[PDB]
Design a protein around this ligand. Structure first.
Ligand SMILES: Nc1ncnc2c1ncn2[C@@H]1O[C@H](COc2cccc(CCC(=O)c3ccccc3C(=O)O)c2)[C@@H](O)[C@H]1O
Length: 439
């Protein structure tokens, strides 16, 4: 790509085409640039300049979306913040993130930040469009880190997604996931990348939120919610992510006429890295722009959507390792161009002198049709350091698998105890470890 602010590009190309539904109010691009203009001008009178660090603490609402466009058009570095993050955690994070303003349309409670207010004044206040300008700072989720992205990176993310998921002139993506996550940002950038339509509507049941839309992004529990309510859903495409996506979910969805795409994404990549139409264990081959490789069982990623760095103690620190890749801490395998996530390196533990990857042992056991869930959890052992324990939820009554595993797992991977998953953990690896150490 764009030679001007995305919303102004489409204003010139297709100005009278409808761009946005905000609570059922329809705005074409010309009208949209006009509302953003009023807010961007109001922010500038209150001190927001190119590079200002601004906390946007809020849930998705039409105001929040407009405020984002306005803040960005001023050239600000936007840190959207989940209103549920507690004040003590923010008191720890904020002073290191080089912020001067807070917009909470709640109350600002951080007196080092000047309180911003939605204010309509006259003007077309805009910083000059610059794809390489810093756009956002998204919290990862120890202390959250602030992954920083340029406009260019969000646009590269969008380009890749839209190479898999057709999204065109008439289509309409619901802003279905929070803008304080990369998921909701990705929807906004896909909308703007394509110059299509987005819908933003104050909170109502998801079934109603979806009215008139063609596309949505869901976490798996949102999709389950729709299926259990037997909601009528009429979509071209749903993109799922945030976790592994069970085959049963997508089969149940397919039966309701819901075309699902499954993605592997990360905060550091401003959303989706690998993706596929729902079909197999893998997370699909890398989206165009992205590259994947496995080193010493670790998934490494490279893309134009990668964050410029993490904002540390007032400065930008690069994400990349000595080869120019991001080391994910995810354990993976590549077969036939497709990535499979085996587990998290943070869960690996040692028993004797062997590495037990819980997720691998879990997969083997879970294939037993009596088994609905299995977690493999270390417990302290003098002779061997740790030994695996199975914590199980069975389909009906429990079954003895202590023999059935002996030809499917090596000795060091076989559980030394088989326990039952308690109600307090149905619908956390530390919690399971802690619970097992009291059993
Ligand atoms: N498809 C997978 N298989 C298996 N493990 C996975 C996994 N997707 C993550 N994960 C795991 O969960 C970890 C972190 O996952 C995320 C954390 C923060 C942000 C995100 C991106 C979420 C996302 O961007 C999104 C969510 C809902 C709907 C659409 C989208 C989207 O726009 O792409 C993922 C990964 O490192 C993996 O260990």
């Amino acid at each position: 790509i764009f030679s001007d602010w995305p919303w102004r590009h489409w204003r010139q190309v297709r100005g009278e085409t409808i761009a946005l539904r905000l609570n059922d109010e329809q705005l074409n691009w010309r009208e949209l640039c006009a509302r953003v203009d009023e807010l961007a001008s109001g922010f500038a009178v209150q001190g927001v300049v190119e590079g200002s660090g601004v906390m946007l603490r809020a849930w998705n609402t039409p105001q929040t979306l407009l405020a984002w466009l306005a803040l960005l058009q001023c050239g600000a570095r936007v840190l959207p913040v989940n209103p549920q993050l507690p004040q003590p955690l923010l008191e720890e994070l904020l002073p290191n993130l080089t912020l001067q303003f807070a917009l909470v349309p709640g109350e600002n409670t951080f007196p080092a930040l000047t309180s911003l207010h939605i204010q309509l004044v006259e003007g077309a206040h805009a910083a000059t469009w610059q794809p390489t300008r810093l756009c956002s700072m998204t919290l990862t989720s120890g202390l959250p880190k602030a992954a920083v992205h340029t406009y260019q990176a969000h646009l590269a993310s969008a380009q890749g997604v839209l190479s898999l998921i057709p999204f065109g002139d008439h289509d309409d993506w619901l802003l279905s996931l929070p803008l304080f996550h990369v998921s909701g940002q990705g929807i906004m950038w896909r909308w703007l990348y394509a110059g299509a339509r987005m819908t933003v509507r104050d909170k109502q049941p998801l079934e109603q939120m979806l009215a008139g839309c063609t596309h949505a992004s869901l976490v798996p529990t949102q999709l389950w919610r729709l299926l259990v309510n037997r909601s009528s859903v009429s979509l071209k495409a749903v993109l799922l992510g945030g976790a592994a996506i069970p085959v049963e979910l997508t089969e149940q969805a397919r039966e309701q006429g819901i075309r699902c795409f499954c993605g592997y994404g990360l905060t550091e990549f401003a959303s989706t890295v690998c993706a596929k139409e729902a079909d197999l264990a893998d997370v699909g081959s890398p989206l165009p722009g992205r590259e994947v490789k496995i080193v010493n069982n670790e998934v490494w990623l490279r893309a134009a959507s990668m964050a410029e760095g993490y904002w540390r103690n007032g400065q930008l620190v690069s994400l990349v390792n000595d080869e120019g890749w991001y080391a994910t801490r995810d354990r993976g395998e590549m077969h036939n161009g497709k990535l499979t996530i085996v587990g998290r390196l943070d869960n690996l533990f040692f028993s004797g002198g062997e590495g037990i990857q819980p997720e691998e042992v879990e997969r083997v056991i879970a294939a037993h049709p009596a088994v609905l869930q299995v977690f493999i959890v270390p417990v302290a052992d003098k002779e061997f350091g740790h030994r695996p324990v199975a914590v199980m939820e069975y389909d009906h009554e429990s079954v003895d698998l202590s023999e059935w595993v002996k030809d499917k797992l090596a000795r060091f991977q076989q559980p030394v105890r088989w326990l039952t998953l308690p109600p307090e953990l149905k619908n956390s690896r530390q919690a399971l470890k802690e619970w097992v150490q009291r059993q």
